[PDB]
């Protein structure tokens, strides 16, 4: 999950 960790962090530029 650690890989999903920094995903969803990252995912705010994924969202912009």
């Known amino acids: 999950g650690i ?3 920094l ?3 990252l995912k ?3 969202a912009k």
């Open 3 to 5: 890989l999903s960790s």
């Open 7 to 9: 995903w969803k962090k």
């Open 12 to 14: 705010k530029i994924i």
